[PDB]
Design a binder for this molecule. Structure first.
Ligand SMILES: CC[C@H]1OC(=O)[C@H](C)C(=O)[C@H](C)[C@@H](O[C@@H]2O[C@H](C)C[C@H](N(C)C)[C@H]2O)[C@@H](C)C[C@@H](C)C(=O)/C=C/[C@]1(C)O
Ligand SMILES: [K+]
Ligand SMILES: [Mg+2]
Ligand SMILES: [Mg+2]
Ligand SMILES: [Mg+2]
Ligand SMILES: [Mg+2]
Ligand SMILES: [Mg+2]
Ligand SMILES: [Mg+2]
Ligand SMILES: [Mg+2]
Ligand SMILES: [Mg+2]
Ligand SMILES: [Mg+2]
Ligand SMILES: [Mg+2]
Ligand SMILES: [Mg+2]
Ligand SMILES: [Mg+2]
Ligand SMILES: [Mg+2]
Ligand SMILES: [Mg+2]
Ligand SMILES: [Mg+2]
Ligand SMILES: [Mg+2]
Ligand SMILES: [Mg+2]
Ligand SMILES: [Mg+2]
Ligand SMILES: [Mg+2]
Ligand SMILES: [Mg+2]
Ligand SMILES: [Mg+2]
Ligand SMILES: [Mg+2]
Ligand SMILES: [Mg+2]
Ligand SMILES: [Mg+2]
Ligand SMILES: [Mg+2]
Ligand SMILES: [Mg+2]
Ligand SMILES: [Mg+2]
Ligand SMILES: [Mg+2]
Ligand SMILES: [Mg+2]
Ligand SMILES: [Mg+2]
Ligand SMILES: [Mg+2]
Ligand SMILES: [Mg+2]
Ligand SMILES: [Mg+2]
Ligand SMILES: [Mg+2]
Ligand SMILES: [Mg+2]
Ligand SMILES: [Mg+2]
Ligand SMILES: [Mg+2]
Ligand SMILES: [Mg+2]
Ligand SMILES: [Mg+2]
Ligand SMILES: [Mg+2]
Ligand SMILES: [Mg+2]
Ligand SMILES: [Mg+2]
Ligand SMILES: [Mg+2]
Ligand SMILES: [Mg+2]
Ligand SMILES: [Mg+2]
Ligand SMILES: [Mg+2]
Ligand SMILES: [Mg+2]
Ligand SMILES: [Mg+2]
Ligand SMILES: [Mg+2]
Ligand SMILES: [Mg+2]
Ligand SMILES: [Mg+2]
Ligand SMILES: [Mg+2]
Ligand SMILES: [Mg+2]
Ligand SMILES: [Mg+2]
Ligand SMILES: [Mg+2]
Ligand SMILES: [Mg+2]
Ligand SMILES: [Mg+2]
Ligand SMILES: [Mg+2]
Ligand SMILES: [Mg+2]
Ligand SMILES: [Mg+2]
Ligand SMILES: [Mg+2]
Ligand SMILES: [Mg+2]
Ligand SMILES: [Mg+2]
Ligand SMILES: [Mg+2]
Ligand SMILES: [Mg+2]
Ligand SMILES: [Mg+2]
Ligand SMILES: [Mg+2]
Ligand SMILES: [Mg+2]
Ligand SMILES: [Mg+2]
Ligand SMILES: [Mg+2]
Ligand SMILES: [Mg+2]
Ligand SMILES: [Mg+2]
Ligand SMILES: [Mg+2]
Ligand SMILES: [Mg+2]
Ligand SMILES: [Mg+2]
Ligand SMILES: [Mg+2]
Ligand SMILES: [Mg+2]
Ligand SMILES: [Mg+2]
Ligand SMILES: [Mg+2]
Ligand SMILES: [Mg+2]
Ligand SMILES: [Mg+2]
Ligand SMILES: [Mg+2]
Ligand SMILES: [Mg+2]
Ligand SMILES: [Mg+2]
Ligand SMILES: [Mg+2]
Ligand SMILES: [Mg+2]
Ligand SMILES: [Mg+2]
Ligand SMILES: [Mg+2]
Ligand SMILES: [Mg+2]
Ligand SMILES: [Mg+2]
Ligand SMILES: [Mg+2]
Ligand SMILES: [Mg+2]
Ligand SMILES: [Mg+2]
Ligand SMILES: [Mg+2]
Ligand SMILES: [Mg+2]
Ligand SMILES: [Mg+2]
Ligand SMILES: [Mg+2]
Ligand SMILES: [Mg+2]
Ligand SMILES: [Mg+2]
Ligand SMILES: [Mg+2]
Ligand SMILES: [Mg+2]
Ligand SMILES: [Mg+2]
Ligand SMILES: [Mg+2]
Ligand SMILES: [Mg+2]
Ligand SMILES: [Mg+2]
Ligand SMILES: [Mg+2]
Ligand SMILES: [Mg+2]
Ligand SMILES: [Mg+2]
Ligand SMILES: [Mg+2]
Ligand SMILES: [Mg+2]
Ligand SMILES: [Mg+2]
Ligand SMILES: [Mg+2]
Ligand SMILES: [Mg+2]
Ligand SMILES: [Mg+2]
Ligand SMILES: [Mg+2]
Ligand SMILES: [Mg+2]
Ligand SMILES: [Mg+2]
Ligand SMILES: [Mg+2]
Ligand SMILES: [Mg+2]
Ligand SMILES: [Mg+2]
Ligand SMILES: [Mg+2]
Ligand SMILES: [Mg+2]
Ligand SMILES: [Mg+2]
Ligand SMILES: [Mg+2]
Ligand SMILES: [Mg+2]
Ligand SMILES: [Mg+2]
Ligand SMILES: [Mg+2]
Ligand SMILES: [Mg+2]
Ligand SMILES: [Mg+2]
Ligand SMILES: [Mg+2]
Ligand SMILES: [Mg+2]
Ligand SMILES: [Mg+2]
Ligand SMILES: [Mg+2]
Ligand SMILES: [Mg+2]
Ligand SMILES: [Mg+2]
Ligand SMILES: [Mg+2]
Ligand SMILES: [Mg+2]
Ligand SMILES: [Mg+2]
Ligand SMILES: [Mg+2]
Ligand SMILES: [Mg+2]
Ligand SMILES: [Mg+2]
Ligand SMILES: [Mg+2]
Ligand SMILES: [Mg+2]
Ligand SMILES: [Mg+2]
Ligand SMILES: [Mg+2]
Ligand SMILES: [Mg+2]
Ligand SMILES: [Mg+2]
Ligand SMILES: [Mg+2]
Ligand SMILES: [Mg+2]
Ligand SMILES: [Mg+2]
Ligand SMILES: [Mg+2]
Ligand SMILES: [Mg+2]
Ligand SMILES: [Mg+2]
Ligand SMILES: [Mg+2]
Ligand SMILES: [Mg+2]
Ligand SMILES: [Mg+2]
Ligand SMILES: [Mg+2]
Ligand SMILES: [Mg+2]
Ligand SMILES: [Mg+2]
Ligand SMILES: [Mg+2]
Ligand SMILES: [Mg+2]
Ligand SMILES: [Mg+2]
Ligand SMILES: [Mg+2]
Ligand SMILES: [Mg+2]
Ligand SMILES: [Mg+2]
Ligand SMILES: [Mg+2]
Ligand SMILES: [Mg+2]
Ligand SMILES: [Mg+2]
Ligand SMILES: [Mg+2]
Ligand SMILES: [Mg+2]
Ligand SMILES: [Mg+2]
Ligand SMILES: [Mg+2]
Ligand SMILES: [Mg+2]
Ligand SMILES: [Mg+2]
Ligand SMILES: [Mg+2]
Ligand SMILES: [Mg+2]
Ligand SMILES: [Mg+2]
Ligand SMILES: [Mg+2]
Ligand SMILES: [Mg+2]
Ligand SMILES: [Mg+2]
Ligand SMILES: [Mg+2]
Ligand SMILES: [Mg+2]
Ligand SMILES: [Mg+2]
Ligand SMILES: [Mg+2]
Ligand SMILES: [Mg+2]
Ligand SMILES: [Mg+2]
Ligand SMILES: [Mg+2]
Ligand SMILES: [Mg+2]
Ligand SMILES: [Mg+2]
Ligand SMILES: [Mg+2]
Ligand SMILES: [Mg+2]
Ligand SMILES: [Mg+2]
Ligand SMILES: [Mg+2]
Ligand SMILES: [Mg+2]
Ligand SMILES: [Mg+2]
Ligand SMILES: [Mg+2]
Ligand SMILES: [Mg+2]
Ligand SMILES: [Mg+2]
Ligand SMILES: [Mg+2]
Ligand SMILES: [Mg+2]
Ligand SMILES: [Mg+2]
Ligand SMILES: [Mg+2]
Ligand SMILES: [Mg+2]
Ligand SMILES: [Mg+2]
Ligand SMILES: [Mg+2]
Ligand SMILES: [Mg+2]
Ligand SMILES: [Mg+2]
Ligand SMILES: [Mg+2]
Ligand SMILES: [Mg+2]
Ligand SMILES: [Mg+2]
Ligand SMILES: [Mg+2]
Ligand SMILES: [Mg+2]
Ligand SMILES: [Mg+2]
Ligand SMILES: [Mg+2]
Ligand SMILES: [Mg+2]
Ligand SMILES: [Mg+2]
Ligand SMILES: [Mg+2]
Ligand SMILES: [Mg+2]
Ligand SMILES: [Mg+2]
Ligand SMILES: [Mg+2]
Ligand SMILES: [Mg+2]
Ligand SMILES: [Mg+2]
Ligand SMILES: [Mg+2]
Ligand SMILES: [Mg+2]
Ligand SMILES: [Mg+2]
Ligand SMILES: [Mg+2]
Ligand SMILES: [Mg+2]
Ligand SMILES: [Mg+2]
Ligand SMILES: [Mg+2]
Ligand SMILES: [Mg+2]
Ligand SMILES: [Mg+2]
Ligand SMILES: [Mg+2]
Ligand SMILES: [Mg+2]
Ligand SMILES: [Mg+2]
Ligand SMILES: [Mg+2]
Ligand SMILES: [Mg+2]
Ligand SMILES: [Mg+2]
Ligand SMILES: [Mg+2]
Ligand SMILES: [Mg+2]
Ligand SMILES: [Mg+2]
Ligand SMILES: [Mg+2]
Ligand SMILES: [Mg+2]
Ligand SMILES: [Mg+2]
Ligand SMILES: [Mg+2]
Ligand SMILES: [Mg+2]
Ligand SMILES: [Mg+2]
Ligand SMILES: [Mg+2]
Ligand SMILES: [Mg+2]
Ligand SMILES: [Mg+2]
Ligand SMILES: [Mg+2]
Ligand SMILES: [Mg+2]
Lengths: 48, 275
RNA sequence: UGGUUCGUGGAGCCAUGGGGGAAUCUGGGCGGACCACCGCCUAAGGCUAAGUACUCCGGGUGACCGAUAGCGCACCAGUAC
RNA sequence: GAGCUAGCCCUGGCCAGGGUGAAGCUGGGGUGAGACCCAGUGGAGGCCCGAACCGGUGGGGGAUGCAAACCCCUCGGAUGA
RNA sequence: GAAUGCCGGCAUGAGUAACGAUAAAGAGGGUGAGAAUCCCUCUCGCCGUAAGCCCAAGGGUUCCUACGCAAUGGUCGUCAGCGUAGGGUUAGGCGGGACCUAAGGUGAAGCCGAAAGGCGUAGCCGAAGGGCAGCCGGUUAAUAUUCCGGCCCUUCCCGCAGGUGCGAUGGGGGGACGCUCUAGGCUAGGGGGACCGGAGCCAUGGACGAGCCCGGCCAGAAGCGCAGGGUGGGAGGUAGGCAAAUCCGCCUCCCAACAAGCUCUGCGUGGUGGGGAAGCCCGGGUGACAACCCCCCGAAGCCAGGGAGCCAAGAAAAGCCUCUAAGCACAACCUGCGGGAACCCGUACCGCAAACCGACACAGGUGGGCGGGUGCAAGAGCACUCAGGCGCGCGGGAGAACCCUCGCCAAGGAACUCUGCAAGUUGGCCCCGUAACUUCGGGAGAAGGGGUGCUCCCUGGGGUGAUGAGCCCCGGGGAGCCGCAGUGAACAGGCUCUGGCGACUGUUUACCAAAAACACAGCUCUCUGCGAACUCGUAAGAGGAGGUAUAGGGAGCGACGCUUGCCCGGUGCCGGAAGGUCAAGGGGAGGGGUGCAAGCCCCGAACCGAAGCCCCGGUGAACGGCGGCCGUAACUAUAACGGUCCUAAGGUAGCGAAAUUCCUUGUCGGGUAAGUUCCGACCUGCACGAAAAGCGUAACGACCGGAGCGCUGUCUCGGCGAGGGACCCGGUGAAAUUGAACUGGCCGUGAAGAUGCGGCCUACCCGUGGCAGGACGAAAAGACCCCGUGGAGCUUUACUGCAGCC
RNA sequence: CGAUGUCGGCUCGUCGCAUCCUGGGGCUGAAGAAGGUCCCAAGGGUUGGGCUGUUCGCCCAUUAAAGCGGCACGCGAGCUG
RNA sequence: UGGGAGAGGGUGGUGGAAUUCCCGGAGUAGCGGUGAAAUGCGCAGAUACCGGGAGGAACGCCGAUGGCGAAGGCAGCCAC
RNA sequence: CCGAGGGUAGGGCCCGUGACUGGGGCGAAGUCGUAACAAGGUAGCUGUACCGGAAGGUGCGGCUGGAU
């Protein structure tokens, strides 16, 4: 049957992408935390 | 005037449509329309604030002239009468001797090819607009401004009409389509005649699908829902309301007056509504 | 109404959202309602080091651990998944 | 977190084939004029049968499955909410 | 040593289940250390509105070549979507950007919010919508509308020529639109040919034939031809299109109005460039100087912005044309010609799947286009087949029970069972024929029948063409042949009678309920006069609605027919400038503290003083409610009738053992040999009742009752047969569970159901196929039930607060 | 209660005897035939149907008879629902 | 052809009397109702009187034993 | 070929009959009222509508077959 993950490159970068996190205080804290934890990528990969 | 159908389908049994006999032009004026953004009942937050809206036929807005006092003394010919899907009335396309074109809502008795004019000097003939203080007492009238230069507000639905009962001071007394007696300033314009397409109220939708075309989505009874949704929710089996009939938000819906007590307009309303 | 040990208490003091609204030392605030005497202090402008806090960083030192412990990671770990 | 799902908004796309034969118009009859009748024409409809497509009625299988909802036979709608 | 402990490791089940669609295989040759599995050939089978081919998304080298086989591949492996390495994606025209606007997002101005932030006209961003220039063929191991060939085209810059009042983010035109049906003429695509071209063929009884088999095109600028789209021409006035305007708009006058002319597309032809089969050789050569023609069928595509009818009345903006403002008319724009210039990104490959989403090479899920032919009335249906693609990554045997899927059956025919569940029957088309009842549409495919193949003869109308031949589509008639049987195969309703419920088509518990539940047209109540009510928000702001009482919100009822009675005492709501109570505040009788005192400070009665409540009314399609006991008629029985008590008023019509009846299978009738169900009736209605509607109602229903016909393996009552498993051999090889085990019956005993204790009895050791009575067998710290001063949802005239409103 | 699956039906039995039938008896208000009652006896047998989920019961047609009860109201790692 | 009477019909308009309600004024102890009462209405200001406003229905006098129409039936006034 | 008739299916008309149900007629001395005949104690009658144990009442319109 149809399952929940239906990848969509445009949906991905506009929902979780870098420019989306910088527009709200909550997204900026994500990146702040994610940087503070030393995460290798702050933001999901999507091939544009 | 209201056409029926043969019962060749279960819905065609009772569905009735308008006769459209007074329409003389089947396409709008390209310069007098602009797209009408359907809301679906949702507001600038994206939140349903009116329930059961949406999904109806695509529509274009016909720009109507609810001022009329723009062009005092400039006659115009009634060029056509058209369908408007945004109101119950029909609309009248006017070719002004200016070369200007505009829509008005088409009153009853209007005929294509006649002439209309607006202003104090205007004769009291169907289609003409005047400030109320110049219209004789007892005239039936529509498209009444509620305040000078603010736009025709009252008596715009199909077949509605207002009557000038009398005058005092700068104000005139109208009986509204609701039977209310109200003072309106004498400078307020209005158009003589009643609104046309009076048979609009004898239309039988005939089937569920016709409400959907008009954008009316299905209305669900509070008695069909659950306590979390509505004061009439729950019950084992059917259940009477078992409390004063309330809306979804809990205010009583059987007689509870909702007009604000200290409203400045109350000084201008002579008598509350009719039946 | 907030602060104070003070929860309306005899409830002052400090602060202020609303209404009323002065005076320039013979002016004004305070000493736990208030009143008198005796006293303390000069509101409605500002700045001010040091002694105090903390450890991302660098050292030194352990009756601290010794690879299931010690940091999640002694190793290409915020990785693989 | 509405890439699932629910609703709405914008803009696109899809629905083989067959059946029934509304109003209307035409012609004839009829009448004072009519209503009305008959025939042809027409092609209406949350109309009928049935693929695609959308469903999931009944039974059987499956039950450490092919599958954390599947398979087979049967069945509903299929120009419309 | 235990925590259903945590982490790791290793056992049991066990050589057990399984190895992922029952579309299917066999042989020969080859490669290699090794072969059912890799390569090659022949044979067979499977898909073919796909299981074939293009496109998009997503994936991200998986593509091509070489060399490999540890692991990955459910077996094998010499092979691979694996490992190593090398190679591969080429654009002014294809798609996206350097263009446009959609919802929406953002956001100068501006508004709002303790902070963070929220809004917001213009503007800007935003596409699979608008707009915009490339078609055929060739080439590579791997890319091609991209390289190459031929023939075409666009935009920018500059120049020359000619023309013109040039000029814009401003005005106007245009762009610009629905659904259903659809004309004319074409094309795509297909069928046939006695004609054109073609390597060969004569088998096995016949055929050298009008024989068999293969093929008979594609693209193409200007011009021309056919078919269509768009389009009035001139002048005068002008006050409107937020400046101007010769444009547009309006009015008047002339000329032309199914045309023509002008303009734009489609198709055809077209210089020219291509392509070119079976067969036979070794992807290639040949065939070949290949031929490249006539006839017919013909779109849902094209001309197209075509036409008609209809109601629910069907985006925007740029490109483009025109109009003029500054400005400028040595310019600038238009037309034509010429040269010059023309950037960024994607392009491999899979793409209904082994490469995407499902942890898997997973029977599931995934949008667009093309999708051949013959027959069955049509068709994308069904069967078979082209092109193309596969035989599903374990096999070999056997021929047990039992299981699944399938075929048939004597006599009977629902006797089965909760139930005809399941499976039969029926089955398409044509013709005949078709009831109650009805809202006149229908019920209706009601029911029930008859026809259906093939051959020969005669015959009618239609499209094409031309009016004929031929081709093709519809028939009418006559005489025959064959079989058990002619929609001979596949696909394709069993029917009727009568109840309940719901009018109806729809909707729903994704993943145990599709229903009588929700919705639904329609009905009534009530609120709302517009800065509406109402809703979301602290707000600003939005929705309501660019609507205005024939409108909008809320509530109940639920097509339609006939109807909807009485009670306003209680609660709700509506009304009531009096009266009562009423907080802050006003007032200040009169006390009190302190001070030598003027004074300072504290408390305080009357009296005025809102909404709310009290109080007087109204109000049921507002919350709701609608009696008891006793007596009475010339047989008996029963009470039309009377008495009295109580209430706010005492249940009207209609219906009733009912989706409601406890007693209960009430009683009587019908149906049956027999009827706790069913239908019809009666009424002592435990405990119907009139918009939580009452009683009916044609039509409708994968709803739920009862009955009949038909027909059956449901059954009496079972039997045989088919395949796929089970079984045996070779390959790979799990699982939950498991204190340890050397683990029998009975009668007892034991925490009350003992393999384990007592007594007796039975019993050599170990397995395989089977069946399920026990191991209080496994699974899930029982959902029931209780307990906890556990928790959560929900309610209200429980308590106390809050928003909101007054 | 860190689970002993609960009615009835089907299938499959097996047991007890307070015996429904068949066999053997005594008493009889047993003439005969056919019954009533008690004693002995568990080897075998103990039907098909209509209604209801039904166990039970009632009815129809038969019969030698249409027995009662136990086995976790025998039997869901055997089926039904 | 020339005339005549008539509430004959239909359409559209339009006048006053009165009743009822609402507003205002002035004013107070009851009104109304019957055979007699009572319900009802009224100090929350009724009835009676004046002013104004809203609405519907029927046409007083003329009217007669009259006129018109096929019958049912048709009556303020004006026009077609 | 036709064909008596047999068989299948579906209609129409008439007759008998049916739990129960609706009124009707008739029946020496039942119960309840008193609607009509006098103005019958509310003049009666009438078509229709609603209502009520019952005769009846009432609304609208009509007739005199109505008394003074
Ligand atoms: C569809 C397959 C599943 O089985 C079921 O759904 C069948 C219908 C069940 O009933 C299962 C066995 C449930 O078990 C019963 O739960 C009852 C309250 C108590 C029963 N017990 C004697 C008293 C007990 O047997 C369940 C609670 C246990 C599940 C989780 C389980 O262990 C396995 C479930 C399955 C196999 O996936
Ligand atoms: K319970
Ligand atoms: Mg998706
Ligand atoms: Mg994307
Ligand atoms: Mg995308
Ligand atoms: Mg997206
Ligand atoms: Mg995105
Ligand atoms: Mg790094
Ligand atoms: Mg992130
Ligand atoms: Mg109709
Ligand atoms: Mg019709
Ligand atoms: Mg009209
Ligand atoms: Mg438009
Ligand atoms: Mg526009
Ligand atoms: Mg809405
Ligand atoms: Mg918005
Ligand atoms: Mg937002
Ligand atoms: Mg709403
Ligand atoms: Mg209209
Ligand atoms: Mg006004
Ligand atoms: Mg609409
Ligand atoms: Mg509803
Ligand atoms: Mg409910
Ligand atoms: Mg909720
Ligand atoms: Mg609630
Ligand atoms: Mg409730
Ligand atoms: Mg509910
Ligand atoms: Mg309920
Ligand atoms: Mg109930
Ligand atoms: Mg409920
Ligand atoms: Mg209720
Ligand atoms: Mg209740
Ligand atoms: Mg309530
Ligand atoms: Mg409110
Ligand atoms: Mg009002
Ligand atoms: Mg204290
Ligand atoms: Mg204090
Ligand atoms: Mg204090
Ligand atoms: Mg001084
Ligand atoms: Mg001093
Ligand atoms: Mg001082
Ligand atoms: Mg101070
Ligand atoms: Mg002090
Ligand atoms: Mg002090
Ligand atoms: Mg002190
Ligand atoms: Mg001090
Ligand atoms: Mg100072
Ligand atoms: Mg310091
Ligand atoms: Mg310091
Ligand atoms: Mg260090
Ligand atoms: Mg050490
Ligand atoms: Mg370690
Ligand atoms: Mg350690
Ligand atoms: Mg650290
Ligand atoms: Mg580690
Ligand atoms: Mg990571
Ligand atoms: Mg790693
Ligand atoms: Mg969505
Ligand atoms: Mg999505
Ligand atoms: Mg369709
Ligand atoms: Mg026809
Ligand atoms: Mg249909
Ligand atoms: Mg299914
Ligand atoms: Mg589904
Ligand atoms: Mg079935
Ligand atoms: Mg399952
Ligand atoms: Mg399936
Ligand atoms: Mg199927
Ligand atoms: Mg169908
Ligand atoms: Mg269809
Ligand atoms: Mg221990
Ligand atoms: Mg464990
Ligand atoms: Mg533990
Ligand atoms: Mg562990
Ligand atoms: Mg572990
Ligand atoms: Mg071991
Ligand atoms: Mg093992
Ligand atoms: Mg082992
Ligand atoms: Mg082992
Ligand atoms: Mg075993
Ligand atoms: Mg297994
Ligand atoms: Mg398998
Ligand atoms: Mg072979
Ligand atoms: Mg090798
Ligand atoms: Mg091999
Ligand atoms: Mg090998
Ligand atoms: Mg095919
Ligand atoms: Mg991947
Ligand atoms: Mg490639
Ligand atoms: Mg190697
Ligand atoms: Mg390997
Ligand atoms: Mg290997
Ligand atoms: Mg090897
Ligand atoms: Mg492997
Ligand atoms: Mg292997
Ligand atoms: Mg595998
Ligand atoms: Mg490549
Ligand atoms: Mg590349
Ligand atoms: Mg090129
Ligand atoms: Mg492309
Ligand atoms: Mg550029
Ligand atoms: Mg833009
Ligand atoms: Mg914003
Ligand atoms: Mg954007
Ligand atoms: Mg685009
Ligand atoms: Mg081209
Ligand atoms: Mg090469
Ligand atoms: Mg020019
Ligand atoms: Mg110009
Ligand atoms: Mg321009
Ligand atoms: Mg469009
Ligand atoms: Mg339509
Ligand atoms: Mg072509
Ligand atoms: Mg063909
Ligand atoms: Mg051949
Ligand atoms: Mg044209
Ligand atoms: Mg060739
Ligand atoms: Mg050659
Ligand atoms: Mg058109
Ligand atoms: Mg726009
Ligand atoms: Mg110059
Ligand atoms: Mg650039
Ligand atoms: Mg690039
Ligand atoms: Mg490429
Ligand atoms: Mg592949
Ligand atoms: Mg491909
Ligand atoms: Mg698929
Ligand atoms: Mg596809
Ligand atoms: Mg596989
Ligand atoms: Mg798959
Ligand atoms: Mg094909
Ligand atoms: Mg067919
Ligand atoms: Mg397959
Ligand atoms: Mg396989
Ligand atoms: Mg085998
Ligand atoms: Mg064997
Ligand atoms: Mg046979
Ligand atoms: Mg046979
Ligand atoms: Mg048989
Ligand atoms: Mg039978
Ligand atoms: Mg039979
Ligand atoms: Mg059965
Ligand atoms: Mg039964
Ligand atoms: Mg049944
Ligand atoms: Mg069959
Ligand atoms: Mg068939
Ligand atoms: Mg009929
Ligand atoms: Mg038939
Ligand atoms: Mg037949
Ligand atoms: Mg034959
Ligand atoms: Mg022709
Ligand atoms: Mg046969
Ligand atoms: Mg069928
Ligand atoms: Mg029933
Ligand atoms: Mg339904
Ligand atoms: Mg109905
Ligand atoms: Mg109904
Ligand atoms: Mg319904
Ligand atoms: Mg469900
Ligand atoms: Mg569920
Ligand atoms: Mg689920
Ligand atoms: Mg189910
Ligand atoms: Mg359900
Ligand atoms: Mg359903
Ligand atoms: Mg529902
Ligand atoms: Mg109704
Ligand atoms: Mg709110
Ligand atoms: Mg608004
Ligand atoms: Mg708006
Ligand atoms: Mg409903
Ligand atoms: Mg309902
Ligand atoms: Mg009826
Ligand atoms: Mg009441
Ligand atoms: Mg009340
Ligand atoms: Mg009351
Ligand atoms: Mg205050
Ligand atoms: Mg003193
Ligand atoms: Mg008050
Ligand atoms: Mg009550
Ligand atoms: Mg009752
Ligand atoms: Mg009653
Ligand atoms: Mg009644
Ligand atoms: Mg009953
Ligand atoms: Mg009941
Ligand atoms: Mg009963
Ligand atoms: Mg019972
Ligand atoms: Mg009975
Ligand atoms: Mg009987
Ligand atoms: Mg019954
Ligand atoms: Mg009874
Ligand atoms: Mg009821
Ligand atoms: Mg109710
Ligand atoms: Mg109810
Ligand atoms: Mg009923
Ligand atoms: Mg019915
Ligand atoms: Mg009916
Ligand atoms: Mg249905
Ligand atoms: Mg159904
Ligand atoms: Mg069988
Ligand atoms: Mg077999
Ligand atoms: Mg292996
Ligand atoms: Mg041991
Ligand atoms: Mg041992
Ligand atoms: Mg015991
Ligand atoms: Mg024992
Ligand atoms: Mg033992
Ligand atoms: Mg022992
Ligand atoms: Mg012992
Ligand atoms: Mg022992
Ligand atoms: Mg023994
Ligand atoms: Mg074995
Ligand atoms: Mg075994
Ligand atoms: Mg066992
Ligand atoms: Mg067991
Ligand atoms: Mg636990
Ligand atoms: Mg527990
Ligand atoms: Mg549990
Ligand atoms: Mg539970
Ligand atoms: Mg308990
Ligand atoms: Mg407690
Ligand atoms: Mg306790
Ligand atoms: Mg608690
Ligand atoms: Mg709680
Ligand atoms: Mg238990
Ligand atoms: Mg356990
Ligand atoms: Mg357990
Ligand atoms: Mg257990
Ligand atoms: Mg015997
Ligand atoms: Mg004896
Ligand atoms: Mg004897
Ligand atoms: Mg025996
Ligand atoms: Mg029974
Ligand atoms: Mg029992
Ligand atoms: Mg019983
Ligand atoms: Mg005997
Ligand atoms: Mg028991
Ligand atoms: Mg049991
Ligand atoms: Mg059992
Ligand atoms: Mg079971
Ligand atoms: Mg059982
Ligand atoms: Mg078990
Ligand atoms: Mg068992
Ligand atoms: Mg059940
Ligand atoms: Mg007074
Ligand atoms: Mg015979
Ligand atoms: Mg009388
Ligand atoms: Mg009398
Ligand atoms: Mg009388
Ligand atoms: Mg008399
Ligand atoms: Mg009575
Ligand atoms: Mg009465
Ligand atoms: Mg009368
Ligand atoms: Mg008389």
């Amino acid at each position: 049957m149809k399952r929940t993950w239906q990848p969509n490159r445009r949906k991905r970068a506009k929902t979780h992408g870098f420019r989306a996190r910088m527009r709200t205080p909550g997204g900026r804290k994500v990146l702040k935390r994610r940087r503070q934890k030393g995460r290798w990528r702050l933001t999901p990969a999507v091939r544009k | 005037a209201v056409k029926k159908f043969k019962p060749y389908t279960p819905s065609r049994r009772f569905m009735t449509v308008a006769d459209f006999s007074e329409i003389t032009k089947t396409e709008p004026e390209k310069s007098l329309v602009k797209p009408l953004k359907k809301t679906g009942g949702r507001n600038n937050q994206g939140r349903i604030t009116v329930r059961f809206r949406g999904g109806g036929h695509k529509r274009l807005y016909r720009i109507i002239d609810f001022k009329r006092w723009d062009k005092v003394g400039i006659p115009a010919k009634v060029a056509a009468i058209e369908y408007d899907p945004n109101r119950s009335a029909r609309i009248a396309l006017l070719h002004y001797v200016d070369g200007e074109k505009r829509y008005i809502i088409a009153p009853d008795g209007l005929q294509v090819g006649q002439q209309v004019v607006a202003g104090p000097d205007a004769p009291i003939q169907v289609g003409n607009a005047l400030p109320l203080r110049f219209i004789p007492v007892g005239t039936v009238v529509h498209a009444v401004e509620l305040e000078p230069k603010k736009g025709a507000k009252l008596a715009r639905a199909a077949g509605t009409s207002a009557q000038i009962q009398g005058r005092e001071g700068d104000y005139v007394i109208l009986r509204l389509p609701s039977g209310e007696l109200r003072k309106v300033h004498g400078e307020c314009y209005a158009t003589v005649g009643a609104v046309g397409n009076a048979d609009h109220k004898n239309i039988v939708l005939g089937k569920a699908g016709r409400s959907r075309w008009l954008g009316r989505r299905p209305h669900v009874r509070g008695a069909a829902m659950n306590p979390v949704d509505h004061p009439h929710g729950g019950g084992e089996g059917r259940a009477p309301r078992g409390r004063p009939p309330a809306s979804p938000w809990g205010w009583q819906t059987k007689g509870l007056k909702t007009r604000k007590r200290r409203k400045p307009s109350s000084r201008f309303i002579i008598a509350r509504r009719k039946k």
